[PDB]
Design a protein around this ligand. Sequence first.
Ligand SMILES: OC[C@H]1O[C@@H](O[C@H]2[C@H](O)[C@@H](O)[C@H](O)O[C@@H]2CO)[C@H](O)[C@@H](O)[C@H]1O
Ligand SMILES: OC[C@H]1O[C@@H](O[C@H]2[C@H](O)[C@@H](O)[C@H](O)O[C@@H]2CO)[C@H](O)[C@@H](O)[C@H]1O
Ligand SMILES: [Mg+2]
Ligand SMILES: [Mg+2]
Lengths: 134, 134
Amino acid sequence: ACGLVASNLNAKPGECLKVRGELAPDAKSFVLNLGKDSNNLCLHFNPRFNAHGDANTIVCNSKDDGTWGTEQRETAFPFQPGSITEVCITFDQADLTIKLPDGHEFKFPNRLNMEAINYMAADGDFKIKCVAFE
Amino acid sequence: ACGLVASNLNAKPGECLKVRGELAPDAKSFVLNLGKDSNNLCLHFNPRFNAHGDANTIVCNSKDDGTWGTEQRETAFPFQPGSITEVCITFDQADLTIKLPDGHEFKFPNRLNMEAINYMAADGDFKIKCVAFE
Ligand SMILES: OC[C@H]1O[C@@H](O[C@H]2[C@H](O)[C@@H](O)[C@H](O)O[C@@H]2CO)[C@H](O)[C@@H](O)[C@H]1O
Ligand SMILES: OC[C@H]1O[C@@H](O[C@H]2[C@H](O)[C@@H](O)[C@H](O)O[C@@H]2CO)[C@H](O)[C@@H](O)[C@H]1O
Ligand SMILES: [Mg+2]
Ligand SMILES: [Mg+2]
């Protein structure tokens, strides 16, 4: 139900998205989205504690005119229910780089070579403490 | 039309809201709202460069079940169109304290005696760089 949605960003390559949130003690999933609008996402970042058949797996994807792209799963899962977590994301026209709080990083392709991000959303089983993209 | 809305906060007295935004070169107004939901706000903070008959004036108010309260106008106006600005807000059951970037502060009464903030919004003539409430 509850969530954060912002359509008033003006983020560009070289800037860093930093999101901090407090994970519910029974957290099943949370989502961070970046893009142009809800139907056009260069990144959907979805740690699944236990959701949609995945356990302790991050699912990433893109969304183009409402259509989900090819999923990319990551096994690094430094997320503890009931605690604060921080995720940082940088990007350029080739890839987004996701930096997890244990020092794991991975790339997700910038499939539509998006160079301006004006939309973000954060929702699921956590309460927001910080969103910065600067 | 664009803006930020979050219903997934869990802010408590002793935590500080910090908002950074890039003001449009022709900015007329921006708004920061805090409360339970869009109809129930312990603080509506509205710097008006030139809007609704006010020039370089901050208008603050509360909103109770959809009804605006008594306005409080502040003359301190350390906001420059085309630049980044930062506003910090603290609160307790008595008052919210607004801390402006030039060191001016003022209090706005917490009329609804709200001790938990789950909702915030930021919109108007700026682009968000940071929202933190922690
Ligand atoms: O791809 C992100 C998207 O996934 C949806 O669930 C997928 C699921 O991960 C996959 O295993 C299945 O094959 O297709 C489902 C439907 O596309 C989620 O529903 C959605 O929220 C996103 O997370
Ligand atoms: O009170 C905040 C609220 O003000 C509305 O405008 C007011 C205006 O400030 C006041 O001078 C006039 O008497 O009543 C108007 C309507 O309540 C704004 O429209 C609204 O956006 C808020 O900023
Ligand atoms: Mg949420
Ligand atoms: Mg008054």
